[PDB]
Coordinates of C-alpha atoms and ligand atoms in Angstrom, one line a residue:
X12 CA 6.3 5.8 15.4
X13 CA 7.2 3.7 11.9
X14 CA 9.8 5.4 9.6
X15 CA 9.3 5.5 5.5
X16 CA 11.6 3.4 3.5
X17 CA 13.3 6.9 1.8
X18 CA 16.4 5.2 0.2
X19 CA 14.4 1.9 -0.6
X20 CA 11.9 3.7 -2.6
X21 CA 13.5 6.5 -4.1
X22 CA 16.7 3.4 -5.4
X23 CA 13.6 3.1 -7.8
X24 CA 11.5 6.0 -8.6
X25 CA 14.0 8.8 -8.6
X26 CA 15.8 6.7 -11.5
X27 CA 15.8 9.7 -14.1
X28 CA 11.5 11.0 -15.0
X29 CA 12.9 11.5 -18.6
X30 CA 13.4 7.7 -18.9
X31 CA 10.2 6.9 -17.4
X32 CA 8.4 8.8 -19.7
X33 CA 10.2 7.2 -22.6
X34 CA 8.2 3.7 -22.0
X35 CA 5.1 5.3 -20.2
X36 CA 1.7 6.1 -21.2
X37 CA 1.5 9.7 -21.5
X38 CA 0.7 10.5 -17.8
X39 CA 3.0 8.2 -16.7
X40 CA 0.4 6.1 -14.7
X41 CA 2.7 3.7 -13.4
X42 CA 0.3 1.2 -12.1
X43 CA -1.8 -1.8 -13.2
X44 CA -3.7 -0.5 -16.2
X45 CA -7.3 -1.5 -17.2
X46 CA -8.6 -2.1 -20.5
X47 CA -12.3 -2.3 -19.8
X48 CA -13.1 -2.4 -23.3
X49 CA -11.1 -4.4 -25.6
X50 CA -9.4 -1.7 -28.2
X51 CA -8.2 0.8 -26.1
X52 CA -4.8 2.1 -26.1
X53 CA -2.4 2.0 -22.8
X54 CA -3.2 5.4 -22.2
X55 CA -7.0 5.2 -22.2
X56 CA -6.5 2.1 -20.5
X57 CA -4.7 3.9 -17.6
X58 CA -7.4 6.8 -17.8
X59 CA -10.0 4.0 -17.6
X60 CA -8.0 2.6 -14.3
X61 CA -8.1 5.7 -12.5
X62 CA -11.5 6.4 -12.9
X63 CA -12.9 2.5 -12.3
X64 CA -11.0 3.6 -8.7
X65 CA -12.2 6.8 -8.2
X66 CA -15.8 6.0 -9.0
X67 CA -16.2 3.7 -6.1
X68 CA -14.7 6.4 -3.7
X69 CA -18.4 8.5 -4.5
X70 CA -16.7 11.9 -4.6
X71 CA -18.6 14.4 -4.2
X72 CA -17.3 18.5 -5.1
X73 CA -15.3 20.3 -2.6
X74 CA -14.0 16.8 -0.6
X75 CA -10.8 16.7 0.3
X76 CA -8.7 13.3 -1.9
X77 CA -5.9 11.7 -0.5
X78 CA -3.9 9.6 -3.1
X79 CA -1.1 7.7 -0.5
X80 CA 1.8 7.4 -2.9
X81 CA 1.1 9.5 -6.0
X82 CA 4.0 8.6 -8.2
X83 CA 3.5 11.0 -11.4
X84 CA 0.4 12.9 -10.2
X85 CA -1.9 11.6 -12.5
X86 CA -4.6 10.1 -10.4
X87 CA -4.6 13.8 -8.5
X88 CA -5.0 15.6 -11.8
X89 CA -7.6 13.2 -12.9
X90 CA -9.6 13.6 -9.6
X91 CA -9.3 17.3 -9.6
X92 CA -10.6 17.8 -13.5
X93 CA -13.3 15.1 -13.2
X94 CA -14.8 15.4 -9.7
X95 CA -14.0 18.8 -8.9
X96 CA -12.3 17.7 -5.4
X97 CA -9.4 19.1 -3.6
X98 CA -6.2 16.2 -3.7
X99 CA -3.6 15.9 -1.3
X100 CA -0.8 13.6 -2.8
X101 CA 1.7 11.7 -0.7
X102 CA 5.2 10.7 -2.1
X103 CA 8.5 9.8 -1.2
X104 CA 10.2 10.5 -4.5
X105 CA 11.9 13.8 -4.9
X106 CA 11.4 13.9 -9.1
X107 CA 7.9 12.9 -8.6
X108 CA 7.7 15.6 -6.8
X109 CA 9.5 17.9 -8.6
X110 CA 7.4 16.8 -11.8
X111 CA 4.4 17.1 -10.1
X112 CA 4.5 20.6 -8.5
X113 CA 5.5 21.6 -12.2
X114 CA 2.7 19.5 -13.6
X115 CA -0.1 21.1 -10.7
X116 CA 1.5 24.8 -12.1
X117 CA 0.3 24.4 -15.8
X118 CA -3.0 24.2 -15.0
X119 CA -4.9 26.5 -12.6
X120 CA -7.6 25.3 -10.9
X121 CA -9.9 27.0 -7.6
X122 CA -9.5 23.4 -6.2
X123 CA -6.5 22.2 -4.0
X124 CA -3.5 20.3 -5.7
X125 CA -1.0 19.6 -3.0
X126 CA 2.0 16.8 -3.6
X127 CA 4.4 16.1 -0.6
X128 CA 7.4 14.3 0.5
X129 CA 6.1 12.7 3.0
X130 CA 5.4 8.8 3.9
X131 CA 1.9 7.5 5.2
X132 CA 3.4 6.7 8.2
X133 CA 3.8 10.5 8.9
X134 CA 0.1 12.0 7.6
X135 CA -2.0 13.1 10.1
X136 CA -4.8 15.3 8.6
X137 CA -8.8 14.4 7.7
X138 CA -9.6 13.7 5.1
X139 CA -12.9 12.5 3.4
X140 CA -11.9 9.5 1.0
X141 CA -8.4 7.7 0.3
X142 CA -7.0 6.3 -3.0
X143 CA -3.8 4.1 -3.3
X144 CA -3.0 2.8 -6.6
X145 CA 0.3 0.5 -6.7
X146 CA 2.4 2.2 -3.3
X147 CA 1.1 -1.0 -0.8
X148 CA 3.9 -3.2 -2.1
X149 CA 6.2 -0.9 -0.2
X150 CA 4.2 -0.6 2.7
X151 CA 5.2 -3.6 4.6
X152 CA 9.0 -2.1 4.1
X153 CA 10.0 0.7 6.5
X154 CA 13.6 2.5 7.5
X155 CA 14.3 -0.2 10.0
X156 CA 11.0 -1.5 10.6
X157 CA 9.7 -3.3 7.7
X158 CA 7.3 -6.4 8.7
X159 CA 3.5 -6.9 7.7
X160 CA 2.6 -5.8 11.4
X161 CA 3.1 -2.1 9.7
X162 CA -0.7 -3.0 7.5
X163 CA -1.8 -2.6 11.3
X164 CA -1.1 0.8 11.8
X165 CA -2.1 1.9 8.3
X166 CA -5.4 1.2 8.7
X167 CA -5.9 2.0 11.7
X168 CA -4.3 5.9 11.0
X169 CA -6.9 6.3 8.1
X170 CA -9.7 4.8 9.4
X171 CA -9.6 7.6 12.0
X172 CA -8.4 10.3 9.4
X173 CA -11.7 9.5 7.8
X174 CA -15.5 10.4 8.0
X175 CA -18.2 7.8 9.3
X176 CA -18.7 7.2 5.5
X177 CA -15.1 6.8 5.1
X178 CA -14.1 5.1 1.9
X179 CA -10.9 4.0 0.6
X180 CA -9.9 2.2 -2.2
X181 CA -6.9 0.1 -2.2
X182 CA -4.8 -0.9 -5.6
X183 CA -2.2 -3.4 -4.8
X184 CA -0.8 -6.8 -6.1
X185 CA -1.5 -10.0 -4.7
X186 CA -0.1 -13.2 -4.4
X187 CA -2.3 -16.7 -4.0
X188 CA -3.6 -17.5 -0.4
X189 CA -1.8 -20.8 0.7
X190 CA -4.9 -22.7 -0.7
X191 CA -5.7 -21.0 -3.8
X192 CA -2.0 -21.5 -4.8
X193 CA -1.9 -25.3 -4.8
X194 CA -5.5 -25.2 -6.2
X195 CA -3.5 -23.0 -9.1
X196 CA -0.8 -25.4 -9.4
X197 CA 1.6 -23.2 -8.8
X198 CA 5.3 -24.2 -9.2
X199 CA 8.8 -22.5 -8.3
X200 CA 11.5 -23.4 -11.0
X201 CA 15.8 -22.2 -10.3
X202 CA 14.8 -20.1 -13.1
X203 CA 11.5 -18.5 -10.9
X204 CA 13.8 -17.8 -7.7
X205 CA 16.1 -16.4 -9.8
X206 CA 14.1 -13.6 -11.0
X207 CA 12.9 -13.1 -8.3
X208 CA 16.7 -12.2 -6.6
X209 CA 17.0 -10.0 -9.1
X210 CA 13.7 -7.8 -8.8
X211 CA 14.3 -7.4 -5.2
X212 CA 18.2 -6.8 -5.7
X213 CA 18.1 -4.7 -8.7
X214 CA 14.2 -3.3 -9.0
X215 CA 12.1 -3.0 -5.4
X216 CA 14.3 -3.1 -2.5
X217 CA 12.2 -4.2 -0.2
X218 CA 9.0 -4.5 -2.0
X219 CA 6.9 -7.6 -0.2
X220 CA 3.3 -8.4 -1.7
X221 CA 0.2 -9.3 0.6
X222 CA -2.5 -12.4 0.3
X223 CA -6.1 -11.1 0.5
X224 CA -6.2 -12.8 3.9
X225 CA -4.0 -10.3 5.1
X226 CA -5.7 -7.6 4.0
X227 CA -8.8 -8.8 5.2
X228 CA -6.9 -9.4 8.6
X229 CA -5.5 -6.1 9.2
X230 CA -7.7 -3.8 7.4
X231 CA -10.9 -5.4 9.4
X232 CA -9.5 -5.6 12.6
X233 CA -9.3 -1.4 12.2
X234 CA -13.0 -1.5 11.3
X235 CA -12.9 -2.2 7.6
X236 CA -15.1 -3.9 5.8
X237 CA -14.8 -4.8 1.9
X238 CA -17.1 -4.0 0.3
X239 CA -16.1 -5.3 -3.1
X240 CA -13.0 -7.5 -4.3
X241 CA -12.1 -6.6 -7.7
X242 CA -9.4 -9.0 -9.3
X243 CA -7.7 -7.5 -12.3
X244 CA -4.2 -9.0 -12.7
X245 CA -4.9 -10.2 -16.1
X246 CA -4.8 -6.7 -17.2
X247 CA -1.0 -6.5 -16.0
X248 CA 0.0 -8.6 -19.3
X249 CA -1.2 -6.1 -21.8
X250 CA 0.5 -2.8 -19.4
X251 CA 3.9 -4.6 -19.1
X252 CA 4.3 -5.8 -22.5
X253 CA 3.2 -2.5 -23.9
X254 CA 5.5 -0.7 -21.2
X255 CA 8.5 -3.5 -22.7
X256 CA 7.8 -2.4 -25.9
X257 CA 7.9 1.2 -25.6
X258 CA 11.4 0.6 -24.3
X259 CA 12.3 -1.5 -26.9
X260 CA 11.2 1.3 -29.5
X261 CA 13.4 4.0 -27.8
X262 CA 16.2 1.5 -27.3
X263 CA 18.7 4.3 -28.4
X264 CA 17.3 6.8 -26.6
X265 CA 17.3 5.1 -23.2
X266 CA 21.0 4.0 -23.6
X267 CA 21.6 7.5 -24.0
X268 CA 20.5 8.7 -20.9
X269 CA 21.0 6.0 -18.4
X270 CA 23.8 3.7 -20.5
X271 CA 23.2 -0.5 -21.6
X272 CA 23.2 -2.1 -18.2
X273 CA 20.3 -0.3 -16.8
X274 CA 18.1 -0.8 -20.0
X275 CA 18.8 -4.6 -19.9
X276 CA 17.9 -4.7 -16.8
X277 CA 14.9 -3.3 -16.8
X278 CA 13.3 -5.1 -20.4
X279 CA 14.1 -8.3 -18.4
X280 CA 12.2 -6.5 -15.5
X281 CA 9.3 -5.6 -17.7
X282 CA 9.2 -8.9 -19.6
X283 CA 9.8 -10.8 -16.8
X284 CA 6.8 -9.8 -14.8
X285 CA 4.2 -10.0 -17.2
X286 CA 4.2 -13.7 -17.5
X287 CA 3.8 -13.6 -13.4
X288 CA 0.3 -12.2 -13.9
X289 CA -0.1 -14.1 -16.9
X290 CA 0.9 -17.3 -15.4
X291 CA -1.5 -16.3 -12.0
X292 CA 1.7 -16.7 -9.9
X293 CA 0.8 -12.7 -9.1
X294 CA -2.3 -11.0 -9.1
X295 CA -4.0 -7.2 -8.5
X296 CA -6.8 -6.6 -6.7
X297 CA -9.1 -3.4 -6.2
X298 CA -10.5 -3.5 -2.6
X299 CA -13.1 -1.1 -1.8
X300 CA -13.2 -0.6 1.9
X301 CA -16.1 0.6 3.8
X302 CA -17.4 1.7 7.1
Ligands
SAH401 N1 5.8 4.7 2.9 C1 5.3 5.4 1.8 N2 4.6 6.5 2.0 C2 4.1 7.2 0.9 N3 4.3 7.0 -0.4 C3 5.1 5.8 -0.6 C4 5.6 5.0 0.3 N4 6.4 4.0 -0.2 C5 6.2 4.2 -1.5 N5 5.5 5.3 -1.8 C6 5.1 5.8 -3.2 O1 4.2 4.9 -3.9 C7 4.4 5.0 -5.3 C8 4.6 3.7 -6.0 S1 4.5 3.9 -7.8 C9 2.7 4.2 -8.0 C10 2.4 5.6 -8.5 C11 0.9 6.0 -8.7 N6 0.1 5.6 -7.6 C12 0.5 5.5 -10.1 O2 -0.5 4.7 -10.1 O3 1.0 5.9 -11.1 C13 5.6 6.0 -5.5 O4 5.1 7.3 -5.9 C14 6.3 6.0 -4.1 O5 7.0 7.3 -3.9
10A402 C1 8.3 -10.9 -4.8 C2 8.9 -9.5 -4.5 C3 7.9 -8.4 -4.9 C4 8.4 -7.0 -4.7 C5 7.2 -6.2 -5.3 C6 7.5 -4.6 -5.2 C7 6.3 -4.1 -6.0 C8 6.4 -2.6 -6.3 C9 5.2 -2.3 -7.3 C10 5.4 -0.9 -7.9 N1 4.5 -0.5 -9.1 C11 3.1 -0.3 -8.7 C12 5.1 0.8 -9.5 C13 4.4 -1.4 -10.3 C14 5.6 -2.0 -11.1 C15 5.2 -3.0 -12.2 C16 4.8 -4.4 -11.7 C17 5.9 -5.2 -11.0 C18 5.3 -6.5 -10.5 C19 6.4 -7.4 -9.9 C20 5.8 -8.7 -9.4 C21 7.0 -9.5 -8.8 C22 6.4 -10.8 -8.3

């Protein structure tokens, strides 16, 4: 069986929450926002993500939702209060899920609102539909067996966790099939490869983004089929920058808690990826997968 990448993931998100939530939105949606109408703020922009996902998922009351890498919680506390459905969140970071099982406390609800420490690679319960917003890029990593083959046994394992009208909707970033990338014009400067070294050195150990082809690939030869590709990366520009900013504004604060090395480090993180999905060398796509 495939082993999650524990120390890989949590080098990242077990960082300090109270610094996160110095440059997040509110509910610390740490994903691809989506400003579906042109004056909304990050945090209506993240609220507006979450449910552009969860409407294609057709949630019904009393289902049982399964968000595969919940990060803060708030996709399962948006599911709960707006569909009325029982969520089962999966997570390998221990003050995710610390803040979460805090978080599901405040609230009480008749509903189901479970968060775990435990990887994808280890669920084995039915469910009726699947959310993942922004965990794929780690996917393809694994304690000693990273590789793409791993997209294999993904969806395989939830296509049989799932009903005959199984739905899942999958939130990841892209990069440019080998065609579409010299179609783009798409150049690799000292400076590029650089940044690169130092996001998967100093940011996501281990982090490796897929083409649509391979998702296409993998997730159809499980059963899949797409039933919508919904490219979004543009939105990426306006999230990081206002993310960069937010850090920016609580400069202070942040060297406070986690010293001057760490926040340089991550503005030139922030700043340095937006122009990726400005500059189309990245992208984020919405696919919603159907039986
Ligand atoms: N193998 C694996 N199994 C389960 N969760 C994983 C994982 N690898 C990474 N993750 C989780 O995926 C998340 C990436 S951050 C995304 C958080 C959330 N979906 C949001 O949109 O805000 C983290 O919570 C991380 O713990
Ligand atoms: C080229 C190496 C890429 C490693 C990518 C690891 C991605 C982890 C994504 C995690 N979330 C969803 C939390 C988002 C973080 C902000 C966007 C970062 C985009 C980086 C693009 C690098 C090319």
């Amino acid at each position: 069986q495939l082993k999650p990448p524990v120390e890989a993931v949590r080098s990242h998100y077990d960082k300090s929450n109270e610094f996160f939530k110095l440059w997040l939105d509110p509910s610390m949606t740490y994903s691809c926002a989506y400003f579906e109408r042109p004056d909304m703020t990050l945090e209506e922009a993240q609220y507006a993500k979450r449910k552009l996902a969860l409407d294609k998922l057709n949630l019904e009351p009393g289902m049982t939702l399964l968000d595969i890498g919940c990060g803060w919680g708030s996709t399962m506390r948006h599911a709960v209060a707006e569909y009325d459905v029982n969520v089962i969140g999966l997570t390998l970071s221990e003050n995710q899920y610390a803040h979460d099982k805090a978080m599901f406390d405040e609230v009480d609800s008749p509903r189901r609102k479970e968060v775990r420490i435990q990887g994808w690679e280890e669920f084995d319960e039915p469910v009726d539909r699947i959310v993942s917003l922004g965990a794929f890029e780690h996917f393809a990593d694994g304690a000693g067996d990273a590789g793409f083959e791993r997209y294999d046994t993904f969806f395989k394992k939830f296509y049989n966790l799932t009903p005959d009208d199984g739905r899942m909707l999958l939130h990841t970033i892209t990069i440019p099939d080998k065609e579409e990338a010299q179609e783009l014009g798409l150049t690799s400067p000292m400076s590029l490869l650089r940044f690169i070294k130092f996001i998967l050195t100093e940011i996501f150990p281990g982090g490796r983004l897929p083409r649509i082809s391979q998702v296409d690939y993998y997730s159809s030869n499980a059963g899949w089929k797409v039933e919508r590709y919904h490219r979004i990366g543009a939105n990426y520009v306006p999230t990081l920058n206002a993310w960069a900013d937010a850090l920016q504004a609580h400069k202070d604060e942040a060297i406070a808690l986690k010293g001057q090395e760490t926040c340089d480090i991550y503005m030139h993180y922030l700043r340095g990826c937006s122009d990726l999905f400005r500059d189309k060398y990245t992208d984020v796509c919405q696919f919603t997968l159907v039986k």
